[PDB]
């Protein structure tokens, strides 16, 4: 990366963002700009050439431009299809092409509460020694969320790794999903395993537990 | 016009690394430039190097020492070695070229230096009961278990099943190793009259496994 992208930005459905993207005078300064919008898993795809020109196939609500050694990508309209990475590009001094760090386009929706599971280990696991119990926290926004592993009510501290999809491209939710993982033996010598979730959208913290043997 | 990708996922320090980009619905001749680009985990862009029409090569300076490529007119392939690489150059790898304002993109090639070694993953079921049921809703999945390097995918019903879906980013365990899961929603009155596989591709070690995923008894 060389050129300098905010992070990111955000906004609800429907509304006006804007992405800057800043350079020197040797890159930005004298050469066009384009713009890239990579969705996740994907590769980039091109929305701006020429600083302000639109390939075949990209709709009027995106549009760009450049000013001194700035430029700006302009999205109206937003949808929730929108989420994604957003880069800038442009030549440098040796006409090589450079690229900003990427921006981050989050879409703003409604407070949602996360629907919560969990999952004993499988016997297949358990055959080959080890143990893995997860909890998933689904759809929820926004992305902030707490999960504690408790074991026999003795609170789980780095004993436990969570991840969280990308936003949703429907309806702008996340999920989360945590595993604590013990070995067989010690998976044995305890009953109640549970799950404590905390999140904006619960008015009070959300446990889902099973005891070690009832399935 | 389509450009895929092929290539080792792990390579050991010092030794080089090889890609090629197999071009289809264009010939490899009639390409303005054909070029590397890619993207360290987590990060941005960066670009690698492209050939031009005539043969005349460009590189990222600060790599040129040790980047090669070249075009194969008879594979309708072109190609990039990099050598003597460290940690440094995991990332990424897409191959991109202009057709004759909009180049072709590759779909990405994750690469993985590293001096730890292969390992294919265990595949178990995450199975659906009244502890992931949530009204008429019943959450199940698969966990993806002590695996490297990345990348695994995933898909359910031969990827009949797409709605509800959501495959999370694996996590790296203390021991080395990766671990992912994916699950899908699905209607409770389903789980006993649709069957559920989670199909599973770890192309680095040819690992691939449909698991069947059924309910619990608890």
């Known amino acids: 990366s060389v050129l300098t992208q905010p992070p990111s930005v955000s906004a609800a459905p429907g509304q006006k963002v804007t992405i800057s993207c800043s350079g020197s005078?040797?890159?930005?300064?004298?050469?066009?700009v384009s713009w890239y919008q990579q969705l996740p898993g994907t590769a980039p795809k091109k929305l701006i050439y020429?600083?302000?020109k639109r390939p075949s196939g990209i709709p009027d609500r995106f549009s760009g431009s450049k000013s001194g050694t700035s430029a700006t990508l302009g999205i109206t309209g937003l949808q929730t299809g929108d989420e994604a990475d957003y880069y800038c590009?442009?030549?440098?001094?040796?006409?090589?092409?450079?690229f900003g760090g990427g921006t981050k386009l989050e879409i703003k929706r409604t407070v949602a509460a996360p629907s919560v599971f969990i999952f004993p280990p499988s016997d297949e696991q358990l055959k080959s020694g080890t143990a893995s119990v997860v909890c998933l926290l689904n759809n929820f926004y926004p992305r902030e969320a707490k999960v504690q592993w408790k074991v026999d009510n003795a609170l789980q501290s780095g004993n436990s790794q969570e991840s969280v999809t990308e936003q949703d491209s429907k309806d702008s939710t996340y999920s989360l999903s945590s595993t604590l993982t013990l070995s067989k033996a010690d998976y044995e010598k305890h009953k109640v395993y549970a799950c404590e979730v905390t999140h904006q959208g619960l008015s009070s913290p959300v446990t889902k537990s099973f005891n070690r043997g009832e399935c | 016009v389509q450009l895929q990708e092929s290539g080792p996922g792990l390579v050991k320090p010092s030794e080089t690394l090889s890609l090629t980009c197999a071009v289809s619905?264009?010939?490899?001749?009639?390409?303005?430039?054909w070029g590397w680009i890619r993207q360290p985990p987590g990060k941005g862009l960066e670009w690698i190097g492209s050939?031009?029409?005539?043969?005349?090569?460009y590189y990222n300076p600060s790599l040129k020492s040790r980047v090669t490529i070249s075009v194969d007119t008879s594979k309708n392939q072109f190609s990039l070695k990099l050598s003597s690489v460290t940690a440094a150059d995991t990332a990424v790898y897409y191959c991109?070229?202009?057709?004759?304002?909009?180049?072709?993109w590759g779909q990405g090639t994750l690469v993985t230096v590293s001096s730890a070694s292969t390992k294919g993953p265990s595949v178990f079921p995450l199975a659906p009961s009244s502890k992931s049921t949530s009204g008429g809703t019943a959450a199940l999945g698969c966990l993806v278990k002590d695996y490297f390097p990345e990348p695994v995918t995933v898909s359910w019903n031969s990827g009949a099943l797409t709605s509800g879906v959501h495959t999370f980013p694996a996590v790296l365990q203390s021991s080395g190793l990766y671990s992912l899961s994916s699950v899908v929603t699905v209607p409770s009155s389903s789980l006993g009259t649709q069957t559920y596989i989670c199909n599973v591709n770890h192309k680095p070690s040819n690992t691939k496994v449909d698991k069947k995923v059924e309910p619990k008894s608890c």
């Open positions: 005078s040797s890159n930005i300064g004298n050469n066009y």
């Open positions: 619905g264009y010939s490899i001749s009639s390409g303005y430039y």
């Open positions: 590009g442009t030549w440098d001094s040796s006409l090589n092409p450079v």
């Open positions: 020429d600083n302000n």
């Open positions: 991109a070229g202009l057709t004759q304002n909009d180049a072709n």
């Open positions: 050939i031009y029409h005539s043969g005349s090569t």
